[PDB]
Design an enzyme around this catalytic site. Structure first.
Site, PDB file in Angstrom:
ATOM      1  N   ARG A  49       0.607  -1.160   0.037  1.00  0.00           N
ATOM      2  CA  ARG A  49       0.193   0.050   0.268  1.00  0.00           C
ATOM      3  C   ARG A  49       0.820   1.629  -0.162  1.00  0.00           C
ATOM      4  NH1 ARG A  49      -3.185   2.671   4.416  1.00  0.00           N
ATOM      5  NH2 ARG A  49      -4.976   3.850   3.112  1.00  0.00           N
ATOM      6  N   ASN A 123      -6.770   7.450   1.988  1.00  0.00           N
ATOM      7  CA  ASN A 123      -6.682   7.183   3.387  1.00  0.00           C
ATOM      8  C   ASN A 123      -7.468   8.362   4.744  1.00  0.00           C
ATOM      9  OD1 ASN A 123      -5.039   7.587   6.182  1.00  0.00           O
ATOM     10  ND2 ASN A 123      -5.255   5.626   5.217  1.00  0.00           N
ATOM     11  N   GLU A 124      -9.093   7.264   5.115  1.00  0.00           N
ATOM     12  CA  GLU A 124      -8.953   7.571   6.760  1.00  0.00           C
ATOM     13  C   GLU A 124      -9.633   8.214   6.030  1.00  0.00           C
ATOM     14  OE1 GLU A 124      -6.166   8.001   9.416  1.00  0.00           O
ATOM     15  OE2 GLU A 124      -5.335   5.492   9.420  1.00  0.00           O
ATOM     16  N   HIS A 189      -8.948   0.035   9.222  1.00  0.00           N
ATOM     17  CA  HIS A 189      -7.670   0.688  10.501  1.00  0.00           C
ATOM     18  C   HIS A 189      -7.616   0.045  11.864  1.00  0.00           C
ATOM     19  CE1 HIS A 189      -6.359   3.326   7.076  1.00  0.00           C
ATOM     20  NE2 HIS A 189      -7.083   2.324   7.246  1.00  0.00           N
ATOM     21  N   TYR A 191      -6.529  -0.141  15.346  1.00  0.00           N
ATOM     22  CA  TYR A 191      -5.356   0.512  15.916  1.00  0.00           C
ATOM     23  C   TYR A 191      -6.147   0.621  17.856  1.00  0.00           C
ATOM     24  CZ  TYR A 191      -2.828   2.178  12.592  1.00  0.00           C
ATOM     25  OH  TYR A 191      -1.595   2.404  11.290  1.00  0.00           O
ATOM     26  N   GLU A 219      -5.219  -1.175   7.552  1.00  0.00           N
ATOM     27  CA  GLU A 219      -3.396  -0.402   8.204  1.00  0.00           C
ATOM     28  C   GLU A 219      -4.039  -1.412   9.706  1.00  0.00           C
ATOM     29  OE1 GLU A 219      -2.764   3.446   8.687  1.00  0.00           O
ATOM     30  OE2 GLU A 219      -2.622   3.978   6.913  1.00  0.00           O
ATOM     31  N   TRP A 246       1.560  -1.380   8.995  1.00  0.00           N
ATOM     32  CA  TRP A 246       1.651   0.059   9.022  1.00  0.00           C
ATOM     33  C   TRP A 246       2.588   0.204  10.039  1.00  0.00           C
ATOM     34  CZ3 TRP A 246       0.016   4.491   6.510  1.00  0.00           C
ATOM     35  CH2 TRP A 246       0.988   5.253   6.701  1.00  0.00           C
TER      36      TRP A 246
HETATM   37  O1  LIG Z   1       8.557  17.549   8.079  1.00  0.00           O
HETATM   38  C1  LIG Z   1       9.417  17.252   7.342  1.00  0.00           C
HETATM   39  C2  LIG Z   1      10.551  16.001   6.615  1.00  0.00           C
HETATM   40  O2  LIG Z   1       8.922  15.534   6.924  1.00  0.00           O
HETATM   41  C3  LIG Z   1       9.214  14.047   6.582  1.00  0.00           C
HETATM   42  O3  LIG Z   1       7.507  13.468   6.835  1.00  0.00           O
HETATM   43  C4  LIG Z   1       7.151  13.801   7.462  1.00  0.00           C
HETATM   44  C5  LIG Z   1       5.526  14.131   6.495  1.00  0.00           C
HETATM   45  O4  LIG Z   1       5.108  15.172   6.461  1.00  0.00           O
HETATM   46  C6  LIG Z   1       3.936  13.755   7.807  1.00  0.00           C
HETATM   47  O5  LIG Z   1       4.485  14.635   8.952  1.00  0.00           O
HETATM   48  C7  LIG Z   1       3.909  12.294   8.227  1.00  0.00           C
HETATM   49  O6  LIG Z   1       2.981  12.032   9.279  1.00  0.00           O
HETATM   50  C8  LIG Z   1       2.646  10.424   9.368  1.00  0.00           C
HETATM   51  C9  LIG Z   1       3.679   9.942  10.704  1.00  0.00           C
HETATM   52  O7  LIG Z   1       4.601   9.659  10.402  1.00  0.00           O
HETATM   53  C10 LIG Z   1       3.264   8.777  11.337  1.00  0.00           C
HETATM   54  O8  LIG Z   1       2.905   7.502   9.939  1.00  0.00           O
HETATM   55  C11 LIG Z   1       1.561   8.186  10.675  1.00  0.00           C
HETATM   56  O9  LIG Z   1       0.688   7.823  11.419  1.00  0.00           O
HETATM   57  O10 LIG Z   1       0.430   9.687   9.722  1.00  0.00           O
HETATM   58  C12 LIG Z   1       1.467  10.510   9.985  1.00  0.00           C
HETATM   59  C13 LIG Z   1       0.715  11.061   8.685  1.00  0.00           C
HETATM   60  O11 LIG Z   1      -0.986  11.211   8.673  1.00  0.00           O
HETATM   61  O12 LIG Z   1       5.561  12.151   9.021  1.00  0.00           O
HETATM   62  C14 LIG Z   1       6.630  11.917   8.138  1.00  0.00           C
HETATM   63  C15 LIG Z   1       8.030  11.776   8.048  1.00  0.00           C
HETATM   64  O13 LIG Z   1       7.612  12.428  10.180  1.00  0.00           O
HETATM   65  C16 LIG Z   1      10.352  13.598   5.976  1.00  0.00           C
HETATM   66  O14 LIG Z   1       9.460  13.598   4.255  1.00  0.00           O
HETATM   67  C17 LIG Z   1      11.055  14.076   6.075  1.00  0.00           C
HETATM   68  O15 LIG Z   1      11.932  13.976   4.560  1.00  0.00           O
HETATM   69  C18 LIG Z   1      11.353  15.279   6.408  1.00  0.00           C
HETATM   70  O16 LIG Z   1      12.577  16.189   6.434  1.00  0.00           O
END
Ligand SMILES: OC[C@H]1O[C@@H](O[C@H]2[C@H](O)[C@H](O)[C@H](O[C@H]3[C@H](O)[C@H](O)[C@@H](O)O[C@@H]3CO)O[C@@H]2CO)[C@@H](O)[C@@H](O)[C@@H]1O
Length: 294
Positions: A49, A123-124, A189, A191, A219, A246
């Protein structure tokens, strides 16, 4: 391509297909594709996914990137469940509309791939516990995806951030009936709410499949700080219900107990990753490739 009849998903050879796979946060780590996607296949996943962005919250995945990730999946003998993540938890119809427009915009990457790709509309979408409002959204938009020439099996997440599967029990047939191709399946999903104990896992599965609707646990997690992954695996195996853990790698600190792998290449799985790959009813034991791949 894929087709749904009652509570079974069938591959293009007409063989029942039971998803056993992994979520990968592609949208946030776009440059990991060529490492992460093949690494997921090496664990025996029959389905990946793939998290995409329509630009609502994160960096838009363009048409070339979609083509790239799909191709990496099918050339590693995985089905690609593509999903737009930018509407997560939102009640507003505008967020669902934005995801629907994205699929239509990107249709030339999807059309012709109906035997290897399933489209998880958003998603959701719809965070509140309201089956009617949730249903009305999908009743409205599924015909628009069909009108655009998309003939793929469609996957619809339950209301409540996927954790209110009562929505599917109460209104899932209405949603399915709105699809003129009758080729729609549902996802929960699981949890701490929807997967919090064995009874709850089984009753939530039962409440969909006993409506003769097809089901994946799109998930799920494990106990943190709970979530009964052992029953999700075991009862899924008993009932032929699909599941998708997940997630591979890259959760933010707060959710990093959910990473299945220490490294993008999957040489060093976490305890959670090992449970999913190598444990009872896990990928090595139960995952069979779609027969489109052999
Ligand atoms: O912010 C800079 C940093 O971002 C990184 O990607 C993040 C995304 O922007 C989201 O914030 C993402 O959110 C997920 C969480 O990590 C959990 O998986 C989850 O359950 O759901 C949310 C979204 O629904 O998180 C990632 C990682 O922190 C990444 O792109 C990095 O390169 C960058 O520097």
């Amino acid at each position: 391509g894929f087709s749904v009849d009652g509570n079974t998903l069938y591959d293009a050879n007409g063989q029942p297909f039971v998803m056993r796979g992994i979520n990968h946060g592609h949208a946030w780590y776009k440059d990991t594709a060529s490492t992460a996607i093949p690494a997921i296949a090496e664990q025996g996943a029959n389905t990946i996914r793939i998290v995409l962005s329509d630009g609502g919250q994160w960096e838009k995945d363009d048409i070339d990137t979609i083509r790239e990730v799909i191709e990496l999946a099918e050339q590693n003998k995985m089905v690609a469940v593509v999903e737009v993540h930018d509407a997560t938890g939102r009640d507003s119809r505008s967020d669902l509309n934005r995801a629907v427009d994205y699929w239509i915009e990107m249709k030339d990457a999807l059309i012709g791939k109906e035997d290897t790709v399933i489209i998880n509309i958003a998603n959701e979408w719809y965070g509140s516990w309201d089956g009617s409002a949730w249903a009305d959204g999908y009743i409205d938009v599924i015909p628009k995806l069909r009108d655009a020439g998309l003939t793929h099996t469609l996957m619809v997440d339950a209301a409540g951030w996927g954790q209110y599967p009562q929505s599917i029990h109460d209104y899932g047939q209405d949603v399915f009936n709105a699809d003129p191709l009758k080729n729609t399946m549902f996802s929960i999903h699981m949890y701490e709410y929807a997967g919090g104990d064995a009874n709850t896992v089984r009753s939530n599965i039962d409440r969909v499949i006993d409506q003769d609707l097809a089901l994946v646990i799109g998930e799920f997690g494990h106990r943190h700080t709970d979530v009964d992954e052992d029953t999700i695996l075991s009862y899924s195996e008993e009932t032929g219900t699909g599941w998708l853990a997940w997630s591979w790698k890259g959760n933010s600190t707060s959710w990093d107990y959910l990473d299945l792998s220490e490294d993008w290449a999957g040489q060093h799985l976490t305890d959670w990753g090992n449970r999913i790959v190598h444990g009872a009813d896990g990928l090595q034991e139960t995952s069979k490739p779609s027969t489109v791949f052999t």
